[PDB]
């Protein structure tokens, strides 16, 4: 199970990923859902991580690559 670049978030990330995995395998891919049923764990995780990501010098470049649509 994967580590987050910010260790403080790793545990939460594990919870979000676990939930997402079940929703993906059982519901989304089986055509039974088009929503994000993982809102609690996602919120926790994404907050912790974004706290870390402001400290890192990477947010500008990442944002620029997010305004890009490589597809």
């Amino acid at each position: 199970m994967s580590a987050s670049f910010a260790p403080e978030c790793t545990d939460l990330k594990t919870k979000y990923d676990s939930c997402f995995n079940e929703w993906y395998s059982e519901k989304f891919l089986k055509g039974k859902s088009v929503e994000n049923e993982c809102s609690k764990q996602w919120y926790a995780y994404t907050t912790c991580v974004n706290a870390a990501l402001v400290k890192q010098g990477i947010k500008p470049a990442l944002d620029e690559a997010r305004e890009e649509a490589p597809f």
Partner: protein
């Protein structure tokens, strides 16, 4: 900017659900030790019912030893993916976020069900050439100045 393109094809003897789930879970694993961390930046289902994810990886590695005299221990990589559960198809895009001045490595991969067939194309883009030009320009300058001094002086000396 030099550009090199490579392409690759793979066949998975198993189902799309397992391949795409594996893709979302491919780290950590013993054959990709340079992966330090992977994080999910954003994920939602879009207008057409496709899953759109963006993730952030950090891998470690050395700049190639011969580029040193012209580095950094870690590189960030963005991975962007679309999954279409209807057609059983997936498209992925990875590239490095930093050190882009030196090189940019872009990889597109599309997974499609037939067994699951994967098409990859990587575009390496370099500027390693442009880096040498700076050091050489400097060397050239300094050398030229040195020699201009020696020519003038030597000539004056002998003319005396």
């Amino acid at each position: 900017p030099m550009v090199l393109l490579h392409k690759s094809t793979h066949i998975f003897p198993t189902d799309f659900a397992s391949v795409s789930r594996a893709f979302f879970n491919r780290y950590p694993n013993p054959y990709s030790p340079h992966v330090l961390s992977i994080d999910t930046i954003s994920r939602n289902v879009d207008q057409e019912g496709n899953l759109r994810t963006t993730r952030l990886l950090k891998k470690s590695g050395k700049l190639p030893t011969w580029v040193k005299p012209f580095g950094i221990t870690e590189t960030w990589i963005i991975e962007v993916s679309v999954v279409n559960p209807a057609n059983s198809t997936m498209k992925t895009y990875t590239r490095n976020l930093d050190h882009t001045g030196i090189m940019k490595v872009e990889e597109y991969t599309t997974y499609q069900f037939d067994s699951t067939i994967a098409d990859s194309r990587v575009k390496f883009s370099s500027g390693f050439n442009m880096g040498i030009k700076s050091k050489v320009e400097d060397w050239s300058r300094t050398k030229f100045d040195e020699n201009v001094k020696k020519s003038r002086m030597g000539m004056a000396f002998v003319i005396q």
